[PDB]
Design a protein around this nucleic acid. Structure first.
Ligand SMILES: [Mg+2]
Ligand SMILES: [Mg+2]
Ligand SMILES: [Mg+2]
Ligand SMILES: [Mg+2]
Ligand SMILES: [Mg+2]
Ligand SMILES: [Mg+2]
Ligand SMILES: [Mg+2]
Ligand SMILES: [Mg+2]
Ligand SMILES: [Mg+2]
Ligand SMILES: [Mg+2]
Ligand SMILES: [Mg+2]
Ligand SMILES: [Mg+2]
Ligand SMILES: [Mg+2]
Ligand SMILES: [Mg+2]
Ligand SMILES: [Mg+2]
Ligand SMILES: [Mg+2]
Ligand SMILES: [Mg+2]
Ligand SMILES: [Mg+2]
Ligand SMILES: [Mg+2]
Ligand SMILES: [Mg+2]
Ligand SMILES: [Mg+2]
Ligand SMILES: [Mg+2]
Ligand SMILES: [Mg+2]
Ligand SMILES: [Mg+2]
Ligand SMILES: [Mg+2]
Ligand SMILES: [Mg+2]
Ligand SMILES: [Mg+2]
Ligand SMILES: [Mg+2]
Ligand SMILES: [Mg+2]
Ligand SMILES: [Mg+2]
Ligand SMILES: [Mg+2]
Ligand SMILES: [Mg+2]
Ligand SMILES: [Mg+2]
Ligand SMILES: [Mg+2]
Ligand SMILES: [Mg+2]
Ligand SMILES: [Mg+2]
Ligand SMILES: [Mg+2]
Ligand SMILES: [Mg+2]
Ligand SMILES: [Mg+2]
Ligand SMILES: [Mg+2]
Ligand SMILES: [Mg+2]
Ligand SMILES: [Mg+2]
Ligand SMILES: [Mg+2]
Ligand SMILES: [Mg+2]
Ligand SMILES: [Mg+2]
Lengths: 201, 117, 144, 64
RNA sequence: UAGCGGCGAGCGAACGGGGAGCAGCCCAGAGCCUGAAUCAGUGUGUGUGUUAGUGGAAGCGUCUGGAAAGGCGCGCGAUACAGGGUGACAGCCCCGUACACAAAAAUGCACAUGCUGUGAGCUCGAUGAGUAGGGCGGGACACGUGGUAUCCUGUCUGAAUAUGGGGGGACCAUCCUCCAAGGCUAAAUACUCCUGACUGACCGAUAGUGAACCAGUACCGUGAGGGAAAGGCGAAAAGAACCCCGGCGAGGGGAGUGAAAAAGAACCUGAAACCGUGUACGUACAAGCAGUGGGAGCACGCUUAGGCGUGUGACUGCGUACCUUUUGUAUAAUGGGUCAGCGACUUAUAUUCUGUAGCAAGGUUAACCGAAUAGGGGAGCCGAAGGGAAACCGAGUCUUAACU
């Protein structure tokens, strides 16, 4: 599998099972759903009839009066009563198998290649930590909505990309499928390709 | 989430209350009565699509029997004449001719009498 | 390929029953429960093996046997597991290092199941007759 | 939580190779001088659980 | 799971393995060297916080509009496009944010060190008696007295003591291991009255705390105690000068403010039940779930008169509500005065089946680490072999002396 580079106009040999795999949509949808469920915080609760502030005394007697039977003012059919199935703080995280997560990444990186949404350069640096310099460089690259993966830790690049919402900058380890889909273009350092190929076999 | 269902239950009640226009009293004002009256109106409408086809055939037959007895033959003779003369005119058209064109009904009667004789 | 073009596989997601939401849903007023039983009650139902008041099967029938503690520390070994060790020698400590039998195991037999294609010295373990023939045919040396 | 095994059925039934259950016969514990030896001889060996009562056993023995 | 158990309902380990975290010491006593380690307290010094704070970038024109932050142009900042406010939606109006700093004084935490007290180390010893154990009665151990080890003790007793004793699940023997009847000890662990920061596929005023509002209030009760309802004018009060009717009223009509007063304080939007005024049609010889099918007439619109619509509905065929429960209800069996709002098959963990997806005789990790939805981690679990009560045998095995 060969990836031509943008700036120096060279080639780069990669694995076809990694960057030319057929798109398994149901796998990718399963992984993207589990990622968005892992982001889910799940902090809520309501009060049951056990947890409503009140007293456990019958508001009226069982019979003799003309009214309907009632045992508690905390009843979930009363105003300001409990919730019938009041919620608890629950964890919405799903398990994703490791081979299914890597199958999804190899699927969507093959699709970004087939859709020309993947740009490969040797290096992508900004000299001083300025968003004006980064926006100038991305305008010269004709890029607006982009993910920038770098096989190193560039602090000036992190600072120059922190204020731009169209732009996100990741390490090659910290890549995720929903970002790789949510961004229009993805720029990879050739080192980041080598690291992604090592992680993804 | 707490889905608040006021909009849906309002439009669902107004769909029934619009169908219940013209009804007397709470049948046009009250959802519990109107919905109970719309279902019965659909039952009657399903029934009376069948009863329309009965009642018009009965009306047509009574008009043919009258015009045939004006020309001096009964209905059952006249239909047996038109069967033996093979005349396949349905009795909507026979009632229409029996009203507007009594001459053509007389010619049909004479064909039926000649088919019986 | 965007987030509004993904879709799951066919038959993967099924909707799920919602009891007590109208005639047309099928699961109407009763919700699959019938009328006026114990089963229709909230929390209702009988426990396992309850046959009415009839004497259940697990008490009509007698107890039998006992439990051998030595069977929990015995194990059986395929011939296909003999290649997964290193050194070409097979002991208990080698199989436990290969995570085959487990730590608390003190006895093991080798059984004719699978097949081996390499000479393996077996030491301190019982061997069946067919595994003895297959090991000795592949070049093995069963000893103690 | 885990399901708890009905320990009497675990002392009364054993799962076989294809998933069936073996069990001991009844009527062979006392009152044995009036029973024919043919009957006892056909009661010593273990029998399989029938198709009708195999559901209550599986409900009692969830962990095989 | 092993077991316990009217062997019922149910209760339910341990050994061992993977991890977080790790820390050891002293008196039952004399000497020898004497203040030597460590700890406590109290000072001092430095650093780091906390308790007030400071600076903090960069926009104009035009159109609509009551009002520009909106639209259309043209620029600029960004380690600051977190957030909020400003007359509609503001990176560049304001407060802030990123970042950079700041404490007279009090105080926390680290070190360092001063002082007080504390003893350090070596040698030789000593080695926790009404105790262990036992009998009786109870209790705890997963173990309900059972064949029941072990632990506790109310009662009665009662050892040996390093050549000795305890345990190894009745018990004895051998062997292994440990040394009771004196104590101390950080971390990993549990929780949140309270404080600060931030977050939410949490609520949005019958919800969410009982309480968005002077709510544990009003009110009730002798009392303990119970326990509500009730949010929104407008951008800004500019909250209606003045005139008129009226009781020096209430209330209203003008005028005025305002973008708007059918935003006027009983104030955003203002649905329904319910109650009215007006118009059209029908109705005082006509019997019943009140409709439906047909259908005259009248009124009103459109229109090339073409005739369609709309409203009403004389007369006429048929037609005894809904729900529930029932063999079966117009039933004179239940329930509902009506409207609006709320109101009932959920959640967690195990297990099985189906579907679907991944790998495939293999599949998969949990804890945890990790800045971290990755990767590591294969403790383990399920499966690829079963039979037998079991030892055991093994594609066979059990039964039996042996199986046609
Ligand atoms: Mg009481
Ligand atoms: Mg509530
Ligand atoms: Mg309340
Ligand atoms: Mg993981
Ligand atoms: Mg809600
Ligand atoms: Mg009305
Ligand atoms: Mg019922
Ligand atoms: Mg019944
Ligand atoms: Mg039933
Ligand atoms: Mg219940
Ligand atoms: Mg009985
Ligand atoms: Mg016996
Ligand atoms: Mg300031
Ligand atoms: Mg500023
Ligand atoms: Mg506005
Ligand atoms: Mg001692
Ligand atoms: Mg004792
Ligand atoms: Mg004893
Ligand atoms: Mg005792
Ligand atoms: Mg004693
Ligand atoms: Mg003892
Ligand atoms: Mg023993
Ligand atoms: Mg001690
Ligand atoms: Mg409201
Ligand atoms: Mg409230
Ligand atoms: Mg006034
Ligand atoms: Mg009002
Ligand atoms: Mg407003
Ligand atoms: Mg209003
Ligand atoms: Mg109204
Ligand atoms: Mg009249
Ligand atoms: Mg009249
Ligand atoms: Mg009912
Ligand atoms: Mg009855
Ligand atoms: Mg029935
Ligand atoms: Mg009856
Ligand atoms: Mg009837
Ligand atoms: Mg009546
Ligand atoms: Mg009734
Ligand atoms: Mg009754
Ligand atoms: Mg009633
Ligand atoms: Mg309602
Ligand atoms: Mg399930
Ligand atoms: Mg599946
Ligand atoms: Mg056989």
């Amino acid at each position: 599998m060969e990836l031509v580079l943008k700036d120096a106009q060279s080639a780069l040999t990669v694995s076809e099972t990694t960057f030319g795999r057929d798109f398994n949509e149901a796998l990718v949808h399963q992984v993207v759903v589990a990622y968005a469920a892992g982001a889910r915080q799940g902090t809520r609760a309501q009060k049951t009839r056990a947890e409503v502030t009140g007293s456990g005394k019958k508001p009226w007697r069982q019979k003799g009066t003309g009214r309907a039977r009632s045992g508690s003012i905390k009843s979930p059919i009363w105003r300001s009563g409990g919730v019938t199935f009041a919620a608890r703080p629950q964890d919405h995280s799903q398990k994703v198998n490791k081979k299914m997560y890597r199958g999804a990444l190899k699927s969507i990186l093959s699709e970004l290649v087939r859709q020309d949404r993947l740009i490969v350069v040797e290096k992508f640096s900004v000299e001083a930590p300025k968003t004006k310099l980064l926006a100038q460089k991305l305008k010269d690259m004709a890029l607006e909505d982009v993910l920038i993966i770098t096989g190193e830790l560039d602090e000036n690049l992190f600072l120059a990309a922190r204020n731009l919402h169209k732009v996100d900058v990741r390490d090659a380890t910290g890549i995720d499928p929903v970002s790789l889909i949510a961004f229009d273009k993805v720029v990879m350092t050739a080192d980041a390709v080598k690291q992604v190929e090592e992680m993804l076999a | 989430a707490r889905v608040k269902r006021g909009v849906i239950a309002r439009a669902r009640h107004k769909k029934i209350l619009k169908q219940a226009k013209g009804y007397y009293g709470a049948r046009s004002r009250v959802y519990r009565v109107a919905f109970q009256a719309v279902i019965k109106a659909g039952q009657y409408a399903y029934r009376d699509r069948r009863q329309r086809k009965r009642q018009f055939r009965q009306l047509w037959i009574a008009r043919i029997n009258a015009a045939a007895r004006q020309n001096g033959i009964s209905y059952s003779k006249f239909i047996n004449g038109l069967k033996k003369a093979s005349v396949e005119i349905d009795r909507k058209i026979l009632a229409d001719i029996a009203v507007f064109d009594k001459v053509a009904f007389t010619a049909l009667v004479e064909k039926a009498k000649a088919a019986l004789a | 390929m965007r987030l509004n073009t993904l879709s799951p596989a066919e038959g993967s997601k099924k909707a799920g029953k919602r009891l007590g939401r109208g005639i047309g849903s099928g699961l109407g007023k009763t919700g699959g429960r019938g009328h006026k039983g114990q089963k229709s009650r909230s929390g209702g139902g009988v426990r396992r093996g309850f046959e009415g008041g009839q004497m259940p099967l697990y008490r009509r029938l007698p107890k039998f046997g006992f439990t051998s503690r030595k069977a929990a520390i015995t194990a059986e070994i395929r011939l296909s597991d003999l290649a997964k060790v290193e050194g070409g020698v097979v002991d208990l400590n080698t199989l436990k290092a290969a995570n085959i039998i487990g730590i608390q195991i003190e006895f093991a037999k080798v059984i004719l199941a699978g097949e081996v294609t390499t000479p393996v010295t077996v030491r301190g373990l019982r061997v069946t007759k067919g595994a003895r023939a297959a090991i000795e045919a592949a070049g093995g040396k069963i000893e103690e | 939580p885990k399901i708890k095994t009905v320990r009497g059925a675990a002392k009364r039934f054993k799962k076989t190779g294809k998933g069936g259950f073996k069990h001991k016969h009844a009527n062979l514990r006392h009152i044995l001088t009036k029973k024919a030896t043919k009957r006892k001889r056909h009661l010593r060996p273990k029998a399989m659980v029938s198709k009708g009562d195999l559901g209550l056993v599986i409900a009692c023995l969830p962990y095989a």
